[PDB]
């Protein structure tokens, strides 16, 4: 007589079988983690780690393993393009295999608890009826959680016993796994400081232990016990859901805005870095300093590493994909191979021209070549439209400094017009669109997909918190 | 495609084991009468 949407309510008053279903779920999650990790290794291409990072390859789970200090693989390749002399037991393949083994082990433990459901542990000594001491149980689990939180941030992050975490250059040029020294001053609260993660987990873990000890010793007041309906187990579900979707939102926001726990070299550049010209300002600052040293303008641009110039590209922008533009980033505009070098535009009479970069909002932006002052000089008519300042009439020319085509110059309107369109997209690159039959439409990076997935779940779980909260408070009327 | 091969082998072996164990589970024929 149970409708299709209450089939799982049979385990509400059955602690023995409640542990079983929770065990089975944990087995499914672990099975996914191992299977997904194995899937990504079979497709990852560790050849080029500069112009083809893993965030450019649509790898979702691989960044998370590498964030906590797993870099080598049993195939002899390291994430940084090294030789991987001593992969050890803990490698991408090993960790993925470990989860599957654990996934299977939990499956067996699930069957046992399902069959043996009636245990003397779940029976109240005073009365033979089944019962659960929720206030005390929460004390035990919180006590365990505090220890792990302290254990993680005291040994694994600080490098005392573990490897550490992934720290990186502000511009995501040099990155690696290093120990993190805890930061205790107010400086340790800014998001982009790795020291905060070590400091937080030490402090939060310690307080978790003290609170866990407290909730064991001190029983809830009679008023709260009845006001909060601590007897029922629904209240634990509704309140727990509330905490979960709070965590999802914080994780979603921290991922979208960037932080010390989501390095750009590991997950991909942020959207707001393109809006504010984060990398463009750095490149110009570096180039100008080189010019002041007395070096030529051609070699100054060659001094810019291709990694930095590959970030200054609108294609590497999480806010440019589509909802149904599925697949890896490389499937959008091919594989990035080679950097063609900074493009400099000049009109006939001498003034240099700059191409207005495409705002992140627009999907089709007109091509505008602006003078140093800002007045539009050269254009590209919409199509087959009467023109007064098109490339031909003003006859602008494009010169490449640095990169693959350093020193070359072009004047053919067809070629200049071709490179003008590429100029508004950021730095100019050469893409191999035949290996994967790339469509040409920008996809989204794992930063974009993670944020979308977890904000949607956060909203849906808000409804769940309301529904389960409503049933708890109004238990008598719903029950009968 | 290793994943497809593993999936197909798993399905095939599951079904074959089901077949064998099912034919084992039956009890021998006998005549209640006579």
């Amino acid at each position: 007589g149970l409708p299709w949407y209450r089939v799982h309510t049979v385990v509400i008053n059955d602690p023995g079988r409640l542990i079983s279903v929770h065990l089975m779920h944990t087995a499914l999650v672990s099975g996914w983690a191992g299977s997904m990790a194995l899937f990504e290794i079979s497709v990852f291409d560790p050849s080029d780690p500069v112009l083809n990072p893993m965030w450019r390859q649509g790898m979702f789970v691989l960044p998370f393993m590498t964030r906590l200090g797993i870099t080598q693989s049993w195939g002899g390749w390291t994430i940084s393009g090294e030789t991987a002399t001593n992969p050890g037991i803990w490698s991408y393949e090993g960790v993925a295999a470990a989860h599957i083994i654990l996934s299977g082990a939990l499956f067996l433990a699930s069957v046992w608890h399902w069959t043996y459901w009636d245990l003397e542990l779940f029976r109240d000594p005073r009365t033979g009826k089944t019962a659960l001491d929720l206030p005390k149980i929460f004390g035990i689990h919180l006590f365990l959680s505090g220890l792990l939180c302290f254990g993680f941030g005291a040994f694994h992050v600080t490098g005392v016993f573990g490897p550490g975490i992934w720290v990186s250059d502000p511009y995501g040029l040099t990155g690696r796994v290093q120990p993190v020294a805890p930061s205790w001053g107010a400086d340790g609260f800014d998001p982009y400081n790795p020291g905060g993660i070590a400091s937080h987990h030490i402090a939060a873990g310690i307080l978790g232990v003290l609170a866990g000890l407290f909730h064991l010793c001190v029983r809830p007041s009679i008023r709260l016990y009845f006001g909060l309906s601590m007897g029922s187990i629904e209240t634990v579900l509704s309140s727990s859901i509330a905490a979960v979707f709070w965590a999802a939102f914080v994780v979603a926001g921290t991922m979208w805005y960037g932080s010390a726990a989501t390095p750009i070299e590991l997950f991909g550049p942020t959207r707001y870095q393109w809006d504010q010209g984060f990398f463009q300002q750095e490149i110009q600052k570096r180039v100008q300093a080189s010019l002041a040293e007395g070096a030529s303008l051609s070699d100054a641009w060659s001094r810019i590493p291709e990694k930095l110039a590959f970030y200054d590209y609108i294609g590497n922008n999480p806010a440019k994909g589509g909802l149904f533009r599925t697949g890896a980033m490389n499937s959008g505009d091919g594989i990035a191979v080679g950097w063609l070098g900074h493009a400099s535009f000049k009109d006939q009479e001498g003034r240099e021209l700059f191409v207005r970069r495409m705002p992140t909002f627009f999907e089709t932006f007109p091509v505008l070549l602006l003078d140093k002052d800002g007045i539009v000089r050269a254009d590209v008519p919409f199509r087959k439209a009467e023109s007064k300042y098109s490339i031909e009439q003003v006859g602008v020319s494009v010169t490449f400094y640095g990169g693959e085509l350093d020193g070359l110059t072009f004047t053919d309107p067809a070629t200049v017009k071709k490179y003008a369109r590429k100029a508004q997209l950021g730095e100019i690159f050469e893409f191999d669109r035949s290996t994967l039959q790339s469509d040409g439409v920008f996809r989204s990076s794992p930063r974009g997909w993670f944020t979308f997935g977890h904000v949607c779940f956060a909203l849906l779980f808000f409804f769940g918190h309301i529904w389960h909260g409503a049933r708890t408070i109004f238990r008598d009327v719903f029950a009968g | 495609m290793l994943t497809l091969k593993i999936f197909v082998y798993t399905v095939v072996t599951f079904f074959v084991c089901l077949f064998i164990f099912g034919f084992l589970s039956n009890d021998p024929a006998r005549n209640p009468g006579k």
């Binding site: 067996l108 069957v111 | 091969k5 593993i6 082998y9 798993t10 072996t13 084991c17």
Partner: peptide
């Protein structure tokens, strides 16, 4: 060796459930 591994896994699973 995929055959051997798969068969060993399926047989072990069934036996373990029973035991």
């Amino acid at each position: 060796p995929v055959l051997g591994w798969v068969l060993l896994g399926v047989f072990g699973t069934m036996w373990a459930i029973w035991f």
